[PDB]
Amino acid sequence: YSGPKLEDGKVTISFMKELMQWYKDQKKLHRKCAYQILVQVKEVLSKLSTLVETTLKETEKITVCGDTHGQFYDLLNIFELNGLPSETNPYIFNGDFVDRGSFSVEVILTLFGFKLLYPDHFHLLRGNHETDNMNQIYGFEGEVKAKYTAQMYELFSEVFEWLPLAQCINGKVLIMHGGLFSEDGVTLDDIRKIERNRQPPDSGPMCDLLWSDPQPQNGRSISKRGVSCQFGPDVTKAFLEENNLDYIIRSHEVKAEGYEVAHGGRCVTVFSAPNYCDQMGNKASYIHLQGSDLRPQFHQFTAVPHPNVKPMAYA
Ligand SMILES: [Mn+2]
């Protein structure tokens, strides 16, 4: 084995750079190293609140990405466009790191790598595809069993259980993968109290955060996904007012342009997987926010070449 190794059992910036090059060339990280990252990140994640609260001072910025879905070569393109993660270049990745794309293992161990290297500046939120049900159908379990073993897969499942469910910047912007709630009156305190180390239930606040979608019309509708609901602008407005927030950012739905701003400004979608599943032809984006001005600035990008492995080859 001539590949990437931890230094004194710990991630460093040169390990991350070597890892990204090894994966680019389609090589595999030794299982003992993969194991080391997974157990260390479980310990870092298990300490966090379900709601991560982050303060952006006035000269500080942060980058919010949406779904990446195993599109490793597009993940690399984000860091090329926008810079590597660092204490002065923080990132939030908003769920759905794995499934569908056939480089899910590469995406997730690079993200967990960076989370270990920059724990206060590199943030991962749980999406609905960081769950067993989804992984078993949409490729990630298949992929892990192929590259490692069922054991390694069970360890990834347990680490996903500790991913925080939402993030709040400056008590003003709330970020979550899916969206808002199927009942009125949920508060930031309620989110903070969710016991999140589990597979999500069929219903309730934890389920809604991962699974819900905005709709243009007022009210709530039964979801076309069969779980949670669609929520109208009136739901968003009431939630923002009670919680003293400006707007939300969520991901979870593919967008032709890479983003959407719904509910008159209040409900922004960001989606970071360009030409999704090699068929959608969509653009992707990420968002820049800054401490002196939290209004979203959208950056669009398109797909780069990747090796000839098809989407869901492992499902
Ligand atoms: Mn998704």
Ligand SMILES: [Mn+2]
């Ligand atoms: Mn999703």
